[model samples]
Target: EPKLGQPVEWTPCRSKIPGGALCGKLAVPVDYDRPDGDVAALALIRFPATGDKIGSLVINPGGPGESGIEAALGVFQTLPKRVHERFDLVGFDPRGVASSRPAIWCNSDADNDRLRAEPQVDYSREGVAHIENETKQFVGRCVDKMGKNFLAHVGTVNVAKDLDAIRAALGDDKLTYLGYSYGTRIGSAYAEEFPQRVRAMILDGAVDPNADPIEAELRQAKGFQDAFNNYAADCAKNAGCPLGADPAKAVEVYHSLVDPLVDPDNPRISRPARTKDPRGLSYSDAIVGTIMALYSPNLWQHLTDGLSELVDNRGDTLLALADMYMRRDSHGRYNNSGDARVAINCVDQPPVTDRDKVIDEDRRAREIAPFMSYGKFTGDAPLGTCAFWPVPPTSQPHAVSAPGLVPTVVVSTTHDPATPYKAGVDLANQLRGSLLTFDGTQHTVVFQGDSCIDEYVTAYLIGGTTPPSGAKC
Candidate 1:
């Protein structure tokens, strides 16, 4: 649905200027429908090959939010020598993200703080109504406070279109991409929207759009349960199992530690036991933790230590670990994350259109995994941050059949905490020409310390090899 009227030129350059990296910028209309309206910029960072280019690999770091350019800069030097010699690795800051003009802002930090301090959501029918009202109010405030430029146009469907624009600007006929977490959704949408235009794609830590909201929510909810069990199972075999002899008991004891947080009068405790939401330990937090830990088993040692610290030692260790995961800046402010998170999420897929459906799913999640259902399961956000989110996002929740979506490699982690491994299974099943399987424990599995997994992915992206379909490493 992108308005293809404009012919804006994409300027290639270094990202060192505004956000501190060498990158390229191109203008796209804010409202995809109205090409004549005000336009905003989309930026990308490139790591051109040391020799003949392999291909352009667009990078995405989940959140439907985070800056892929920044992520690529953080990891570019480590790619295979041949890939570096052949491919022009590109990282893009999606629309409404940093380095892009008309950036999303809620207009006040005080508002952000106020919403943060509110109670955790409750998903009762009444609670759902409250959230709906709150979302509307939030939308109004967004419109009243900030102009509609950023709010109106941020969504996944539109972003898929934007991806094509970038592809066109770069003059690439096919999209060669590596997307992680929510980034998987972007790449998948791109494949579905323009299947023939896709070449080799690496979708890791993928979010499955084929999943309904609650089914999707519950599957991820259970992923953390898998992680907890995985940790417990490991503890059962280790000298450092913090919960004593039984892994199941250890999990029970850990959740019990957080039981007091549900109390409204519980004095504000910044410690891990109390700082659940304050520490950013919501569903998404679990998803993030689930994925972050999957990146490597060295990280597993950290998780092990963190669990030991929280379960046995006091709470600072786990709280600190969670805080680090949130990526808070030294100024104590979020690092442009939440803004981008809400921007892409609000639009890319459908909001919880069926409140009862979400609530019912939360109920089911309680049985599948008690963690996501705990006090955090409430469906209504405390102050309706999304209520006043400012725009009625245009996109609807939908699925794409990537029939012949060429040579896509889907990586799923066995105990991935965020995007469940089953999502990989489902995505591979959905994509006609894709090969899918496991890289072993946790997260995307590609860079998670398994040379076996890394070699497979590296070869595929560099030389157009496909992972053994339906195989698990």
Candidate 2:
């Protein structure tokens, strides 16, 4: 059946890696049981400490599909000095990731450039349907073309086991882990399954595993919708805001204004006609473009700028901003976003099989999160990606109730659009001895320039002190 053996072989890292400290390949078995069969090689990078070594702190940014080692490089600046100096900071491109061995690239740069140039569809029946179809086709092509090695081997739990293997190979009894967004799940699963092996973990932007795919999706969608609406309301308060005095009408005005952009000959082409962009683009792409713009509040002003550029200025600035979220690279290489997205998502958990069950759940999500019920971009079920993914998911374990544990830290925002703040409350109770809660307007408030949060996390990791339960920082 499935290969379940450890295939990790530590070999001298290729010379191509810049300034190579201690580097090597970890060829984990394709299956933990089938050690003699095929193996998967993951690229590992280790930046060792200068003074006395404490332990290795591994970084895993959750894309389920994203690269870990590369993320380490990206966030190298933000990393705490004490951490870098005391411990070995280890990172790796997870199996099926781009930089790792046996990558999951499915499309050529030419094909990607054309797709990137095209606009994304807005949140409508047609748009959702288009997303569903496109995702299905893209995901299918990736699995069918890439061979089965990655499809079968890249699930989250398996990845967690891989983490264990790495920890063991490194000769460490416990692992120090830090993760964000989807990365939070990685950290949590490790703690759940291997609590004894965990030395310290900080899971920011946590995902509620108890909530199924649809629940999580709808929650994220609501977050997006709320954020968009808040931004709209915020604009009304700003005299310089392009939307004018009544900002409440911003989204609706933007939505209704797209109809005239369609040319009779090619109705498919439309751009935001309300403001500035001269692409004279398609209506559908503009709406989705706007939705993509709301991910970070830091971009609230940027969204205002994008709106001005598209609806008022006739510039491609908004288009460029939207393109970034779609994950188009500089050379249009169409990095690992789509392929890795499916591989990691499918492995974490299978799509829920019950439709009626989902509809009922959706109704509840709508009750608790009505804004996302219409499917704002971020918080909705990521159904499209999983439709064509080939790997059958392992069972989703029972809701992780972190019992018999030390008081863990749970940070939640007051108005987070992606990970609903309520999820933090729901999850906090599941932990046996955990304190949860935070007051913020963003996702994962800890690392986003909050001194109090940084201090709490640092103190916890360094001095073994957790903030008071329900601490509103």
Candidate 3:
């Protein structure tokens, strides 16, 4: 039998850092409902409190497949001294993710590269069949590769359970958690599952857990469309506006340049912008690279440069950006982020099984956001990849109303390209969480040199103090 809620035995991490840090693995039931069997030992990393410590503050950076341990080493290090002094920063790899056992891995590097390298699917009936067959192969491979019942166990609910177990392992009376974008799904679910366990929490670049599953995708499309316009408008002020000087005509210009590249046959080609690497830029990579940079205003430079490169029939800037987003290393090996994300999403949200329904939504999505509609919706509508997932959804979108939960904070960017601003406000309302608004364009704008939002957030975590509701920074 599994020893549930047991404390993890912390140890010095195998890899060396300048200063010492702790690492450990906590074994959670593979399926909480079936606790008598296999356990998943999730990797955990901790930077000990430099000063007096009240408790551990767990952090998760948003990718459903993102490595918390990786974030702790990278972005999470940017947290100010005030937060560092008061709490030990903890990061754990959720199941089916990085450094965690029973991990999700569907495609080999070559297979994945091939998938990425394939030309964009046309909106024709033939195109629909092509992708459906491809996705079936992909899904079948995941099932065969991931072992029985693994994908089903990788949903958000289990991750939340693991969080509570993590809190217990840390010996904290309640949880102090911070989540972003997709990570917000975990925090919101945690509240619903175990509200009283929450001591303090913050959802940055919030995702409304209560959205209509299909509609949410459209909302994100709109968000990206808006972000593209924002980027174009900003670029127009500069000398090297790749989409032309008139921001009004930017969309038209963008289509004129890229729309021809997705032809069913004899597509146009662009190579890496004079890179040593011989790999040609794929159409999917071009699009992924565009959306990736739009995640933050900080990355607009990369996007503009990428577009400029595209103008020269080159794609090195765009290819590299896409590589970063996909977490592929120099050797072309990949972490399971992409695989985990799709697996988690499929299990988290209810899939629309009906082709007609999907087709209707597809039409609406294209109409609403033409910028992202690069033949993704044009073909005879087939069920989405997730619709054929081997496992049923474990959680459905619903408004979260957690009783006995502390007043949490939800920080949102008005022009966040991934998680729209309105969703954050709605999430705040659902959880009775206070809203801290950053009137900027970026994903999860907190602790990146923002004095106002940072101070308020630090104060909240340090003490139980929350910012005034609807406070703007």
Candidate 4:
């Protein structure tokens, strides 16, 4: 017994900004198939237009698990005043994410500690078996705590439906959106399902909807590899090069420097002056830190420092970076972004289950992306927990055809490590949208200091101006 399509009650947010912002909760069904059944309340924040209002522009910062409400709050000052003057900026936290009702939490911080203590698992038969069992126990706890029905509905397809509910609640006939990274998947899914309900969309760091599970993983690995190579070349230019003077040998240098540190048998010789944690950098810490650095060129210096510290048998800096990525605060309380990431990902896509196939993929991945190959021997395959997820996938990979929708803009960076450039190209083609390419390595380009990209996106959102096809900045 639940109310269907209930109006969102927006109130002044707890944080009283000097200017103003409104927070609201929209009641959406746990299962669209049963609209009159149980419902989940979605949390959202809105910054109204300063001048005349064209409509609401929904913004998602990606992560699939990222909090859209927090994203709007975080970037409110950074956003151009002109854009804010033209349209209301709305940030909605999808179901099972932060601040939203029924937020997903798989395990406690103590559980994380215990898991972190375990040795790294990878291609070895025994290692794979160990990880598989650990994942099963983790998934079991999630199911026991959250219930199967709730878990079944937390996927991208439902998230798209939730967006439509928000649109209707705001009295907008069409959706206007800006999505980055995993957010692109949500926008694209919304366009596909409701082609006639779209007004304008700008998908930055686009994800290809058509890619199979393994292909997507491999492409991302390759993307990181390219970014690391670029970093290596740049690192060599500095006098205190961590990987030495030869930029070409950077991958080998990284392997030599880091391989032994992740080994369980590798004894720590020297401890950092900062901390008492005798266990230096673990395999998980190394991989997570590298991935975080790949997100932005601005963070590369942090990566350099972290790697340099690892060279001296101390992992304080790299561990800190990993903690930042995981949203672990000084008090050791996590924001649970990592938990939601895996939970949401497991439901959205089918997990890779075959061990031999995974081994082959690992081999090929290392060959294709040597810089990130440090975990090749360990059980670091993609979808490790997803394989043990109690619930089946809610959505599968498919092409999105939104021919009747309004002209959409897709922005791609030439060397985006996370999303890669080709995915954006493919996504643009799928949506029949114009493509804007920025010649840089940053993860997401628009509104992050690229005038050309910002100008085109602003012009389009402000006046319905579509950029020329294959436009380059």
Against the true structure, what is every candidate's RMSD? 4.8, 5.0, 2.2, 2.7
Q: TM-scores, in order shown?
A: 0.82, 0.82, 0.95, 0.93
TM-score for model 4? 0.93
**TM-score, model 1 to reference:** 0.82
Per-residue lDDT for 132-155 in model 2, tens only? Answer: 676667766776667766577777
Query: Could you tell me how far off, in angstroms, the CA of residue 413 lies in candidate 2 after the best superposition?
Result: 2.1
How well does model 4 score by local distance difference test? 0.81
Best by TM-score: 3
CA lDDT, every prediction? 0.64, 0.63, 0.83, 0.81
Candidate 4's residue-wise lDDT over 1-473, tens digit each? 12466677777888456348988888899999998778898888998889989899899999978999888877677677778897788999888899888888888887775665443534455555666777888888888878888888998989999999889988788888999899999999999888888888999999997898787888988999999888889999987778877989998887666666555343222222223454346656666777788788898898888778767766777777777787877777787577778888989878888876776688788888887665545544543788778889988888887778888999999999899999999999999989999998779977787778888999999888999876899
Q: Any runs in candidate 4 off by more than 4 Å, and if so which?
A: 1-4, 15-18, 117-122, 264-280, 375-383
Pairs clashing in candidate 3? 123-378, 123-379, 273-315, 273-316
Better of 2 and 4 by TM-score: 4
Q: Which prediction has more favorable lDDT, 3 or 4? A: 3
Candidate 1: tens digits of C-alpha lDDT, residues 25-84: 767777778878777777777766678775677888887568777778766745665666
Per-residue lDDT of model 3, residues 269-335, tens digit only: 3222344456656667778888899888888899888788778767788888889999989999999
Give the TM-score comparing model 2 with the true structure, all chains together.
0.82
Query: Arrange candidates by lDDT, highest first: which order?
Result: 3, 4, 1, 2
> lDDT: which candidate is best?
3
Each candidate: how many clashes?
29, 39, 4, 4
